C-alpha cells in the first residue's frame, strides 16, 4: 500500500482511415491431389490443388 | 517502367505496360507536387 507500483495502461481507437494494426494470423498446412477446402489469403473456395 | 531508348529526341512509337511498386495506407489528400534536382 506504500511500495512502488509499475502502471501501464493500453489504448484503441477507430477512424475513418485503413487499419493497418492488425494481430496473429494463423495457418494451415498445404495438401495436394484431393478435393479440399482452402483459404489463400482471403480467397475462400473448394477445389483440388495441382 | 524503365525502358532502353534509342537516340531520340521524341516518345517513341512503342508500347509499354507500367508495373506497380508499391502501396501505401496514408489517408491523406494531394493537390499540388514539385520538382527537385541536384546541383
Ligand atoms: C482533402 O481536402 C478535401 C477538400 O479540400 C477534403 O474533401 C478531403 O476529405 C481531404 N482529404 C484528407 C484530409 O485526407
Redesign the interface.
Given at each position: 500500500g506504500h511500495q512502488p507500483y509499475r502502471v501501464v495502461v493500453l489504448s484503441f481507437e477507430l477512424l475513418?482511415?485503413?487499419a493497418?494494426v492488425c494481430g496473429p494470423k494463423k495457418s494451415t498446412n498445404l495438401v495436394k491431389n484431393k478435393c479440399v477446402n482452402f483459404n489463400f489469403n482471403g480467397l475462400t473456395g473448394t477445389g483440388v490443388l495441382t | 517502367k524503365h525502358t532502353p531508348i534509342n537516340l531520340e529526341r521524341d516518345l517513341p512509337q512503342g508500347f509499354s505496360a507500367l508495373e506497380p511498386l508499391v502501396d501505401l495506407p496514408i489517408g491523406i489528400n494531394i493537390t499540388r507536387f514539385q520538382t527537385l534536382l541536384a546541383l
Open positions: 475513418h482511415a485503413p493497418t | -
